[PDB]
């Protein structure tokens, strides 16, 4: 029935597991299921770079387009030692679903290069990124495959993608990549969208189910752009951020941290002002809200037994695995899945693309407002669907995505 990655199937197999469960609760045509279970195109590149010492080293990278039923392929780029074909495939498929949950006219895609970005000089990294985008010029574009940011790939990387592509093609093409700097056709909203989204989603779901949020305690797992934003917004909306954690451990304040102060220190020193918690203890604190805002696999089945939170908010893709979700659901926890919370990065990227395509840029105010309207709509649709089939949030989102994918796929049909 399904594509089998030869390297590293974890994320892909997780996608297949959710897909198989969702099939039982949505109307899906066989032919749709076929497409959803075999990615369109998986491509592996060899990337020559002339190193600082003048010797040529070859890096390995990937771009996978999973499924384009709903529109052009959209997907991030990872610069990380752990990148593999199987991971990129899994992430591409997750993207098809995410985008479909968000009612976005995007197919799913993902890319990456096996490299430690810190281990290269900026010149070597810029060269590596340019060779990547050069080798992809004929397969990407503002209506083929739109790239964006992901692990180890910041706004400066996006700048280099955009530039390389634009110089190659002889035209200025902002819409080839998202997550760009403001100076280069990026959007105000925002590259702190992941975090705000997570919270707009959360607040919307608590309003619906009588959960009181002003003065609720939040633990945030992870402190990159995503976690920082989660923490800042959670505080703005009147919650107590009692903990933030990195991979070295966590900081704890039963009264709630001074978020901006803690983040000032983290940016300035590259460390939390103090470390109350071991990395293990983070999940086991007494709180209302636990936020998974770091990396895949963060919360497994064993660790789920630690969790004391009423709400668990998956923001990182695959932050909690199926086994932890079943357990936490069995305990009466509200589990907010990645497909919903933190589709915020993707929605912003979309609003970036729309703006780039007709070269007219909304105010920070106007972006915010279109951004909020759309997350409130996505939460509504997912809940309406969950309720009609009496399913949990993830399943509702899944069934929604699948129904939408099935429409685009059956209407378009098989061709060539």
């Amino acid at each position: 029935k399904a594509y089998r990655p030869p390297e590293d199937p974890g994320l892909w197999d997780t996608y297949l597991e959710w897909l198989e469960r969702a099939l039982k609760v949505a109307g899906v045509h066989p032919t749709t299921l076929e497409y959803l279970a075999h990615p369109k195109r998986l491509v592996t590149l060899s990337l020559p770079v002339v190193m600082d010492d003048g010797k040529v080293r070859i890096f390995q990278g990937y771009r996978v387009v999973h499924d384009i039923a709903r529109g052009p392929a959209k997907g991030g780029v990872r610069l990380d030692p752990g990148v593999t074909l199987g991971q990129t495939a899994g992430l591409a498929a997750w993207m098809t679903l995410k985008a479909a949950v968000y009612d976005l006219p995007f197919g799913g895609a993902a890319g990456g290069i096996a490299v430690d970005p810190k281990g290269l000089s900026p010149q070597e990294l810029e060269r590596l990124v340019r060779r990547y985008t050069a080798e992809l010029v004929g397969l990407i574009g503002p209506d083929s495959d739109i790239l964006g940011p992901d692990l180890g790939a910041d706004q400066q990387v996006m700048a280099w993608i955009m530039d390389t592509y634009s110089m190659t093609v002889g035209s200025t093409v902002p819409g080839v990549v998202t997550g760009k700097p403001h100076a280069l056709g990026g959007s105000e909203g925002r590259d702190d969208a992941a975090g705000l989204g997570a919270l707009l989603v959360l607040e919307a779901l608590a309003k619906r189910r009588g959960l009181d949020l002003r003065g609720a305690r939040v633990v945030v797992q992870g402190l990159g752009q995503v976690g920082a934003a989660v923490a800042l917004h959670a505080e703005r909306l009147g919650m107590r951020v009692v903990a933030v954690a990195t991979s070295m451990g966590g900081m704890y304040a039963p009264e709630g941290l001074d978020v901006a102060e803690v983040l000032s220190a983290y940016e300035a020193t590259g460390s939390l002002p103090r470390l109350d918690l071991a990395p293990e203890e983070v999940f086991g604190l007494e709180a209302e809200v636990l936020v998974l805002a770091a990396r895949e696999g963060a919360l497994d089945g064993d660790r789920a037994r630690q969790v004391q939170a009423q709400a668990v908010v998956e923001v990182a893709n695959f932050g909690l695995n199926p086994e932890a979700e079943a357990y936490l659901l069995g305990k009466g926890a509200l589990v907010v899945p990645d497909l919903l919370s933190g589709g915020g990065g993707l929605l912003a990227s979309y609003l970036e693309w729309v703006q780039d395509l007709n070269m007219f840029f909304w105010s920070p105010e106007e972006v915010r407002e279109r951004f909020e309207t759309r997350v409130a709509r996505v939460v509504d649709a997912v809940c309406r669907r969950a309720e009609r089939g009496g399913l949990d949030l993830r399943m509702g989102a899944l069934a929604l995505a699948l129904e939408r994918l099935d429409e685009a796929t059956r209407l378009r049909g098989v061709y060539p």
Partner: protein, 212 residues
């Protein structure tokens, strides 16, 4: 110098003549623009294409298809596609003419165009109907484009046919181009508000008159 009426229709006397007559009745009111009127009595482009199709029984049938660009001055050609056994070249020319008119009357930035396939769709399987739309879409490919010519539904066509045209084109070109046709399903870049537009429009213009 005289510009002779179109040789390729026959000395009759049908839907194209009714359109040019309408052009004629309008010429007294045109002022300095009058000498240009002749151009309205001239389609820019007429493409007659053969659309072969493998039938379900594995044999090959051949259908007549048309895509006409009447006029292209205000913008790209816009007009639907008709699937009807009694469709003729001159009918499609006329209709393409009326689209030039209709588009300008509301001030849309479009020229006028129309297409037709001489076929009774009732007599085709859904599978054959699809291969028909795909082959036609390939054959008029050299005309098509969101900045060139944008087809649409007409008699015996709708969402389904527009979905196939959009798909055929996008695959043929290697990118997703929703705007190559209109009247698509919402799932493919359709618009909200299609069902009530014309009725509401009747009201809007009636009210505008009441106002006066």
């Amino acid at each position: 110098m005289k510009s002779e009426p179109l040789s390729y229709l026959g000395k009759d006397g049908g839907p194209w003549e009714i359109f040019t007559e309408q052009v004629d009745r309008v010429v007294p009111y045109l002022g300095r623009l009058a000498p240009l009127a002749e151009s309205l009595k001239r389609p820019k482009r007429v493409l007659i294409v053969d659309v072969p199709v493998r039938l379900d029984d594995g044999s090959v049938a051949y259908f007549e298809g048309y895509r006409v660009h009447h006029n292209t001055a205000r913008g790209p050609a816009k007009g639907g596609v008709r699937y009807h056994p009694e469709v003729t070249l001159s009918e499609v020319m006329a209709l393409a003419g009326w689209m030039t008119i209709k588009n300008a009357a509301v001030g849309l930035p479009y020229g006028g165009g129309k297409g037709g396939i001489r076929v009774d769709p009732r007599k085709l399987s859904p599978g054959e109907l699809e291969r028909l739309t795909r082959r036609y879409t390939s054959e008029i490919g050299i005309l098509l484009g969101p900045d060139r010519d944008i087809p649409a539904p007409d008699v015996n066509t709708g969402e389904r046919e527009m979905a196939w045209m959009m798909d055929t084109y996008s695959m043929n070109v290697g990118r997703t181009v929703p705007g190559v046709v209109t009247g698509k399903p919402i799932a493919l870049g359709g618009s909200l508000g299609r069902r009530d537009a014309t009725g509401r429009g009747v009201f809007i213009t009636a009210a505008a008159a009441a106002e006066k």
